[PDB]
Scaffold this active site. Structure first.
Site, PDB file in Angstrom:
ATOM      1  CG  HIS A 261      -1.811  -1.184   1.385  1.00 58.30           C
ATOM      2  ND1 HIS A 261      -3.129  -1.237   0.974  1.00 58.30           N
ATOM      3  CD2 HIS A 261      -1.573  -2.356   2.027  1.00 58.30           C
ATOM      4  CE1 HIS A 261      -3.646  -2.405   1.313  1.00 58.30           C
ATOM      5  NE2 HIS A 261      -2.727  -3.101   1.953  1.00 58.30           N
TER       6      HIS A 261
ATOM      7  CB  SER B 223      24.963  20.579 -14.159  1.00 58.38           C
ATOM      8  OG  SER B 223      23.964  20.399 -13.174  1.00 58.38           O
TER       9      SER B 223
ATOM     10  CE  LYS C   8      17.018  16.489 -10.936  1.00 63.75           C
ATOM     11  NZ  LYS C   8      16.256  17.695 -10.503  1.00 63.75           N
TER      12      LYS C   8
ATOM     13  CD  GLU D 226      11.608   9.812 -17.572  1.00 59.59           C
ATOM     14  OE1 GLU D 226      12.081  10.370 -18.600  1.00 59.59           O
ATOM     15  OE2 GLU D 226      11.791  10.243 -16.402  1.00 59.59           O
TER      16      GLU D 226
END
Lengths: 462, 462, 462, 462
Positions: free
Chosen positions: A187, A317, A323, A330
């Site tokens: 959940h 960068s 990141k 995707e």
């Protein structure tokens, strides 16, 4: 720079550098829908090359001059090998039987064969598109045969191999992660532990089952309509043609093609394409789950879940260390959604046959081939550019394991339910760990906690 | 026990405690598909009561005796008020024109009116189901009228009010959270900050736009087919009936019903139902996104995102503090998925009209009404049992803001890009905060960091 | 034949004859999904050209050197005019934000602008892809702006004009056929009469309403995300940029573009694309009905319905006179099914946004543009190659009118119900016409039959 | 009246005539979505009775007192036999794991067992709903087990038997019609002949293949999740329980249930339900084609195709002889459309699992069971009320054979292509038959025409 050919409606200019003829030019004039991205898929064109090569050889049993037959075979081979793709300009949005692409194939093979024999392009001499290249065949039973040849080859050469690479990569990562224990989620709430290996083994099973599902959806794709002619009876073909041409295609491709036992079912419907699309639809559900999971498991670096470090394929960068956008997740999840929509298009087309002939054939095979190519190619890309390079953020995983409230039930056999619940409640209220709280409350020592709370012992039934 | 009625096929037993008649019994014996759960939706039955009340009042202009008309009006009111639901046993999977439910309505209203007049049930005296209750109407233009009345009432009484409550509750939370800054997520990766109020303001706008979309899809639902009779010409009805009955329905409901300008379009297709289903499908996409976001924003308590504390409506275990399953999010996202599937069912039906009549009518209105009721009810439930009680976990949000790597660009104007990137890289390598690292490296003081890094100044353009 | 550029991962060969650069080459290496039929749709590329032209001019307010701005504008214009389509190799199946196509556009415009200024391609001097061509913009708010520009232009230039041509042609045929009475069909059974004009007027209304539906679905397509930057706040763009760039795009296109009032809603979801796809889905249901009707009405010549003679666009054989395959009906109904599937793909993508950013953007716009182009182009082709040339088979229609049993109710006011029923029953039993039977039975004279049975009087209410 | 029960949230009134308890009352108050028509399908409830009976018997190996176990077994049998349906008020739109229905089942079985033992309802004595009825089980692995038991039973008892009856009835009609030659239709245009038996043989093959497809989609439905407990590891159950409970369920049902080899795949996804729905979606495409063909083949009596006389089950009007609406075809094609939409709902749910648990479970099994029941029941109804009574209109078929232009190619070997084409063109121009025209032109005699034009010789290859 053009030659003049003729059809019943009048004269038509055909470019000197093209092997198609008057019927193909006429077809292009009347179906200007969607532009060049809508051209008939190359797998269909190549499959026609196989079919016409097979028919020419078989038809030597039925009167076809061997010199002409062998010129047809060599030209048809060029089509099958992708050497003449530039001579097929027709779009998917054509006559619903696929007859216009059949005629395009017959003209191209006829003119290339004429050239191989040294004759005049456009003359139908000595190779006639209908009388020779389409001999023993019909306008209605040729495209459905090509689309099943094309679907089977794409499944065997693109879709299944791509899924096999993904399965193998997911399985290797499952073994690599077999000892890394993390907190389960149900959940989306924190839950009892499982290893990354166990979680990834579920993905492996989904991909294995996807390949099983696709194979289970193939037996009726191997059934070919060739020989049904106009309405399924075989009027105007020869006894034995249906069986011989399926056996010849089977020999040429190495795949177990057979003639369809009921030609009325084979021409009036394309339920096998609906069936195969359905297997790809189930596959897309599996891959959406796998890719979306991996997307979220890689979220972060600090405000997400942060279990996985995905490979960085597009440069970031310097000021944004850590990141990594999950861009292969995707592409894969976008592909998964596309397959689900394509499946509805196939379903609507498959539901709408009329009497002896389903005339949604080009759209149905377009969507099947699109889904198969996208799933296969996306599986390879997701494998090579994401899965094989995934690393576990074991430092963060271990930290969060020790900060979880979900390990507290290991204490019950040693200190009882009420004290274990009080530890959990206090730790939740104060923001501390179970260990810190259990010690502060005086219920055990640090040594006892380390002895009793062993995540490795919380991973199976007892 | 039973009374004996008849049709041209013979004798039928009709229960003495039922107001339906021989046609309805005959209809039950030939269409048992699905069982009692597939019974025609109550909103359709109520809408038929409105329509028959309107027709009876109008038909006094066209010869109907006022004593008979007023008994029909009273009996039809009972149907419209839900007082006679038990007298409608027919399922959705009946004749595709809905004529069998029209006859069920005619028989029930006939026999209840007869009872109001003191007469003998089943006798068609003094109130005949066809000659009086169906006067000026047809077997083909009544069900499509009832289904548009039903759809419009369900939109106005259930769907839009539920969305309005959700809109208002989300907007209150947006204002409540207007000053709570958190870390954005794009691709699920940490991103620049935004307030919870800003994020919630996106959800508010989606719900506002959903209501706008539903209303934009209502103009052609207000068009009624009554008066088109068998094929759309109006043969065998009276000049003025179409317009008069639509005006009466508008007066009875307070909604702007009008007669359909083209009765052929109104009978041969139900494009307005496809259009309305399409608006509910978009609404479902919005609600999937809102409910799934809230689901994940409430994940935790310690291995998820943990920004929201969702209300706990189902008892939990005392040894599992802090764990709250987002069960209203689950109901809402399951509903959203159902609406998407229902939409494809409506589409397939709407695509398959034949000549003068689309005969997919009962299935189309069932899916439309199902979607409208689920979306409305789920919106109320999600509002009252989740949204209004959502709290922000401000302590965890502030902690994760201070631990984020994303604020580092506030430093660039003060120390330059190079030192800023060095801070972020070092912090990421060491597991420390930007502030700890910036001080250890000797690039700035604690006081300078607090003066230069102000998330409140990173929330808009400059 | 190649120049060397560099990114963070190393060196890359860029063809000397291409205007893209290292970021685009890197993007092609990592997303090899589907092949060249999957390249980003040209309308998206052209819309980017409009957007970048608008941004460059606006950014002169925000420090951009006018000499550089004007070189960007001229290069961006070349992109918008379709002069540089060969320099965009990326496929739909890319990063889900569309950022890779944004970078492809920035590189192409930068290098073409450099060339216009006489500099060295690949040097970023004097036009820098990010610092100049992407000035004031983000990786996340650019593709969504382009996809709305592209959707609106395709609706106004392709979809609506194609539907307008079909409407006008159907309306002309309705007027031409306004006096041709034929037998209606309900449930596919013979029914009371209506004119071909009346039947075609229903089709006209469906197409009119389709255009109304599409226009109703456009108000939120005109809302542009430009200015939301990374998460919707506008951090790192300038005050006024959002409004000025939308006003400039509106001025360049002549369409009523505005900035989106809530940028969080504009980036986190693409509900407007779902809405527009929904309008195209409803349109596809209307066109399936119209085209399938016309298909069956043209069936024959002798074992079908035979009401319409469709134009023959592909030559037939002399020995098959009267046979005309309705191939434009087939292309249109195949397109209709494709739109329904595309709509499900759009819906799945639209339902799956995460937090601040929906990353299904390329797939969603691909399907919307595909449906819009197919519906517009198919409408033109169906109009020009079928509808304008339709003829009524008035000889067959009149014969079947006189042979129908459906005119018998005209006799009831003159000879009563029982005699009229006996005529119908006898004619059905014997295979004769109503007239022949009525005379043989002695119920009227031939002159009476011609006086009483007037189909022209059976076409409306009384 | 009511008894008072309690949960950690306080006191709940429980009706004295109900066997459910406080957890079930609490669940009804928070999930009212849709009303009583959305109650959990009875097949799920019955399947839970089977599962709890199996668990109770197995758990005697794991400490459960035999007197308590045997009372649970008897109470669970009552649930499985449909004797306690009124004690389950919860709707589909509940927690996405189905845990609330699991608790409803535990409470009902607890209280009925307590009553069997002479004890006090609501006391949890001697039978505790969690400690005994849910022993060795979990909140997360029970509902997915029940939904696979339910799906398999519905396939074997309802879906496949209905399709089998349809298969057999279509095959009998194929043999009945084996000698009836009619004109084929391709593109809806007249085509070469085939028998009605041949056409029907296509439908038979489609139904045979539908049954084969459904069975091919059953192997992974037989895999049960019981034993995976919370996240798939089996923590907090006993070694052997998973396997023992699956074997007991297999013995109780006579179906080959097995424990799922990978419990992570079994809990985190319901790909088998998507797979089974996909087979029903293909089946729906087949049935749409069969039912729509029969619909059109029965069209008429005089302005349609008129090859079939369908049974009339609903009284008609004496003045409308020969008119028969194909109402079973309408029910069947509406069902087919519903199945297609239900399939998209199942797909969306199946695509949206999160980490260790897919929480779309109730909606997925509702749509699967709905599709299976509708297809099964519709197949029986379509068989008994349409197929078995279909007659061929042999007089109209023979007439239209003799009036066709399609037989003219039988003449070519005897008079040549040129004269044959002249006959066909003249007949088409004049409205006469091939035979009348061939004689008028003086190309052959009546006797030669009857010797040369033999449709029985135009039904296969040569």
């Amino acid at each position: 720079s053009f030659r003049i050919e003729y059809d019943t409606f009048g004269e038509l200019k055909v470019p000197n550098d093209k092997y198609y003829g008057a019927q193909t030019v006429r077809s292009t004039m009347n179906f200007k829908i969607g532009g060049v991205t809508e051209r008939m898929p190359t797998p269909v064109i190549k499959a026609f090359g196989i079919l016409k090569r097979a028919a020419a050889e078989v038809n030597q049993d039925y009167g076809l001059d061997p010199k002409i037959a062998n010129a047809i075979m060599k030209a048809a081979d060029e089509v099958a090998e992708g050497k003449l793709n530039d001579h097929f300009p027709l779009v998917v949005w054509q006559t619903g039987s696929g007859t216009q692409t059949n005629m395009n194939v017959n003209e191209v093979i006829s003119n290339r064969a004429i050239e191989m024999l040294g004759g005049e392009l456009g003359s139908k001499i000595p190779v006639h598109p209908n009388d020779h290249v389409n001999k023993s065949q019909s306008s209605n039973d040729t495209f459905p045969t090509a689309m099943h040849i094309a679907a089977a080859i794409e499944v065997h050469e693109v879709l299944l191999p791509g899924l096999q690479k993904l399965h193998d990569a997911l399985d290797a990562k499952s073994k690599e992660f077999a000892q890394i224990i993390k907190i389960g989620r149900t959940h989306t709430q924190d839950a009892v532990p499982l290893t990354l290996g166990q979680e990834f083994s579920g993905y492996v099973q989904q991909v294995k089952y996807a390949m099983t599902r696709i194979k289970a959806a193939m037996p009726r794709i191997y059934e070919l309509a060739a020989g049904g002619t106009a309405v399924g009876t075989g009027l105007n073909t020869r006894i034995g043609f249906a069986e011989k041409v399926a056996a010849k295609v089977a020999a040429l491709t190495g795949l177990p093609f057979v003639t369809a036992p009921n030609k009325f079912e084979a021409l009036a419907a394309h339920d096998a394409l609906v069936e195969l699309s359905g297997a790809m639809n189930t596959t897309a559900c599996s891959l959406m789950k796998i890719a979306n999971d991996i997307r979220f498991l890689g979220s972060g670096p600090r405000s997400g879940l942060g279990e996985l470090i995905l490979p960085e394929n597009e440069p970031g960068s310097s000021i944004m260390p850590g990141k990594v956008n999950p861009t292969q997740c995707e592409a894969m999840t976008m592909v998964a959604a596309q397959v689900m929509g394509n499946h509805v298009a196939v379903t609507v087309g498959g539901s709408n046959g009329h009497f002896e002939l389903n005339v949604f054939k080009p759209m149905m095979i377009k969507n099947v081939l699109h889904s198969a190519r996208l799933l296969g190619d996306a599986s390879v890309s997701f494998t090579e550019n994401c899965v094989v390079g995934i690393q576990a953020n074991t430092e963060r995983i271990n930290k969060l394991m020790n900060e979880s409230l979900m390990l507290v039930t290991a204490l019950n056999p040693h200190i009882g339910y009420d004290k274990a619940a009080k530890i959990a409640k206090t730790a939740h209220k104060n923001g501390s760990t179970l260990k810190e709280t259990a010690i502060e409350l005086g219920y055990l020592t640090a040594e006892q906690f380390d002895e009793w709370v062993k995540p490795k012992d919380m991973l199976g039934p007892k």
